[PDB]
Amino acid sequence: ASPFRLASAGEISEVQGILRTAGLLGPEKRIAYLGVLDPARGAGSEAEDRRFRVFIHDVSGARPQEVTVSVTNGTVISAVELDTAATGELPVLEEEFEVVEQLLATDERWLKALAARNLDVSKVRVAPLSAGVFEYAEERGRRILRGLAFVQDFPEDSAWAHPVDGLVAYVDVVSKEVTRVIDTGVFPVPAEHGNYTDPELTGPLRTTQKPISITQPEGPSFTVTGGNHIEWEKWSLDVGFDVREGVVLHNIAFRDGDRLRPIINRASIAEMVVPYGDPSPIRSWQNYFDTGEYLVGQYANSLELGCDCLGDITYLSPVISDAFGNPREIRNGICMHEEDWGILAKHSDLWSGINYTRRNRRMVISFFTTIGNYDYGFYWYLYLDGTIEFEAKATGVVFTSAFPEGGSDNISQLAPGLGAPFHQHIFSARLDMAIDGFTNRVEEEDVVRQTMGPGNERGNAFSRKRTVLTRESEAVREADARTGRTWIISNPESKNRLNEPVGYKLHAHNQPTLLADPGSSIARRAAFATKDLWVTRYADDERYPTGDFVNQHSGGAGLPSYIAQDRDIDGQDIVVWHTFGLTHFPRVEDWPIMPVDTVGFKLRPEGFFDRSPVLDVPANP
């Protein structure tokens, strides 16, 4: 059995049983995170050791625990009580969905605020908003959620149309107490509805769209074996799924002739955060770590055939644990399919008389998640030519506020009285590299302009420079779009037939990084987001750029701590962490439901192959 197979329902039940028998899962315990661990380095040989990591909350007020279990051997490997004021709180629990609203509904201060606004408490929705770390000393070591009110006029109404500005509250979800209710003043609650299925707002539906049918009469060109092992057009990989990260890719490799050549050992989105840029005290604390605080895999959607994924689709239905250790399937949570991708290569040669055209295609592995108002599609693509790409598709409903009567430098107007605070959506891709194996290095490549003069008398020359990042202290890099900056991951011990090291080049989109002041709480908690590229030496326990327990963790954790080790990364087992994101000034067109916008990155072979790897693609039928 592949050590990279998806977790099965029986493994999760086994973890439950092991924890129970060890005294670690009594009736007061709640599993906040559970996932299989990847195999250790050099473990390929041999014998199963499937281990699971578990974060266990306690509803009675006792300290939570981090536990690793061997499901293979039926044993607890390690169990440690956590001091959450030091190392962070556990991820938000599903069962907290309604707790903030419930607590607030019986609080006299909350009710006073609602009564001033003539709002029916039974119509007021409130979400479990993550709290971060600000100036409130009573919150240190306590599990806090914050709450913002949105009115639902009727049960199928979009509450996002009706934000209640000027009001925020903080609660403790263990003691079930409301710690603070803050009312800065009454803003009109926007009146118009945002019901995008109401014919009054949609108008008559278009009747002009004729069907576009995508079929594969012979079935798909990829195979799936062992549950999650993909073979497609020379590519080989395993599709993992983790409740925190979502879809993970393992063992990305390319079969070049008779050799299986590794490229990336593990690819994931290891963090994603949505920092808000509105200085109103109602929202200035808000930074949603969709991955680290909420767990994006947990909220993966079940994808509808013909709707979410069109064509000949092979689904995976990954299994996760509920809060009690029972397995729960996400039916049709991962789509896998190949897509036509236009022209691959084309040339019409006058001298030879040969006219040549070939088509491209890509393998797609995707999932979609919903976190509150946001919905995101995460797409990995493998192309015939060896290119690897990630794309995020951001949609949903925008997070709303009042639009201030005098206008705003930090909020845009969507509808009468309705605002959208500015924000970013910033991702970190963790790419545990294995270019032709684990001995890798990274070079920063810039274009080099040359001065007109001796050796360049016509002033046309230009060049390139590559700078090796030799130690972690040198490996925190920023974009430079003007100079075409990219980063090449190579294997200095593996040369192509031209005696040049094999490599892959990372092409970033060069979007803005974290805009917050560098002294802010968010700049400290999401330090990764302040720089485009980090390179670390691989270590088993360095998994997330924000650290293991993000919720209410004070600044400092993750990448900035890991690189202090100043380890050798010049021809070693290394990990690239690429920050990329969208900066969103919401437009009227984003209301009442947002069209998709996109961001991502790609890696292209750079002297990895001895010539084009797609010369054996046949002409299209």
Place this chain on the structure above:
Amino acid sequence: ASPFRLASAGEISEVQGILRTAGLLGPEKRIAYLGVLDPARGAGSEAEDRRFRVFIHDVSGARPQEVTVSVTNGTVISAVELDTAATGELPVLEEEFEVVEQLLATDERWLKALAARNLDVSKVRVAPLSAGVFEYAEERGRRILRGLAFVQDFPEDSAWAHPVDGLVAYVDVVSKEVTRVIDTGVFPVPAEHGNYTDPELTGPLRTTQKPISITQPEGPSFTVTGGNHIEWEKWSLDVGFDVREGVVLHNIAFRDGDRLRPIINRASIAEMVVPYGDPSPIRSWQNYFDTGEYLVGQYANSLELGCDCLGDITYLSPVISDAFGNPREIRNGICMHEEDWGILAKHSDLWSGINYTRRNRRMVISFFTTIGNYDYGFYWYLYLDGTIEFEAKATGVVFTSAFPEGGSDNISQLAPGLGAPFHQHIFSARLDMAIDGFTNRVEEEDVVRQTMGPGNERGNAFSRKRTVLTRESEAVREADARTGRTWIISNPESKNRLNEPVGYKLHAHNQPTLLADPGSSIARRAAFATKDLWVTRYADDERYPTGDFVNQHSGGAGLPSYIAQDRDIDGQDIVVWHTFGLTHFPRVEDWPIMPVDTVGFKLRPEGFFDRSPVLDVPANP
């Protein structure tokens, strides 16, 4: 009849007849350019006036002419003799394809160079390479082409595999004389073949690709009327075709409710140039203005169904003039089709219980051209949400040289002894704007970082700033990817329902601009390419960023001259010229035939609509 209809065969024959009768097209004349002119402003009412512009070369040595004809009235409007030393030479003629090779084959200096290298002259290919303007005084006012040798071992061999470095020659294609033969020394001619249809090099063809079938059982959702008028999913436009520019889009507009709202009056790629960065005197003069010197529409490919354009395709077959004024059809030269484009909008709402997904699609209008070794696909896309995008797909065979034995700062290695000089492919999109009509302005928008302090005590705030470009002297702009710089075209006299000016935002890729020294010939002849964005006041005669006659024109022409007029562009009829390109350090994977790489730009609505314009899209079948 629409004044924007494609030229017909009969119109071209009529132009021929008119020129003949006027004494302007005797047997020594050759048409180097012919195309319909767009209607004048305010001409919509009324009555036909189809005018054609013609550049007429004379093979006997007499001066060429620029002529405008009214095909409607059977008259010559203007005819002027050109002084080519002043205003530039005419575009390269098709009949010059073989002239450089032919001349050189009987030249003793050329033959001496070939004999030293043991090369059979009958196997030596040479192209009509554009000459530019360098230090050779004898070339001023003369029609010159330069020639580089490539060996074809047999008639179906790819000559690009066998460049003959150290050798270049210059000819006069009117006097049929070889002016210079320069031999800097013998380089080995690379030996390996680059025959990408030879089984020895391809290997056995893959048998693993299963069909991907794209069909439309009810036909397409767009209609074509009047030959070239498209109606699709609220969009309206006319598809033009010009021998120089290729596919042009006219009258791009969007039907918002019962109002046809203009967006872009004319969109084209008005120039494209390929500057080379190798300071060897063998190539340091080379800059191929594929559009302005060669005419990309002229070399548009005939596109094969199921191969080049997949799905339900509607073709146009545009007509151009041959060198004698006879019409020539480019059969199946333009593809039009709609494509599925993934998720348009999606949200799963816990509070309302509504789960909503809609799919996106795009209208595609494309052509493919071949210029020597290069092949480019030009794609325009219209999306359901109002986004407009252009994408160029660059492929073909890379232009080769020897790889110097000591390595090179300006050439990369492709195969043993085979090099690829560094170069860029730089496009200029000319967007004659009409956002809700012709009264438009441009603002540069940057993100604004804010300092932690009073009014921003948590250091989270960020903002945006917009600066109006009020006069042409202020409207030559550069990218700033780090600050998320974009440019918004708005109509200051047309407000959306929120009392904000309607607009569209240009999103650039922020790739490097022209790298050459600013004092070089190429920086002066392709000045447009040195800056990302220019805004001019519309004028009928300001068509190309490089001017009308690019071939052998000294530096200065086009945009830098036009903006000296310093015209008012604040709420006026304006034109945006966006420079964008690829910087290519060729990789081993690009040999022997290059996979596609891409560059482009998009424009997204920015408060153009009163809410999302896709709320009336129905759920997918």
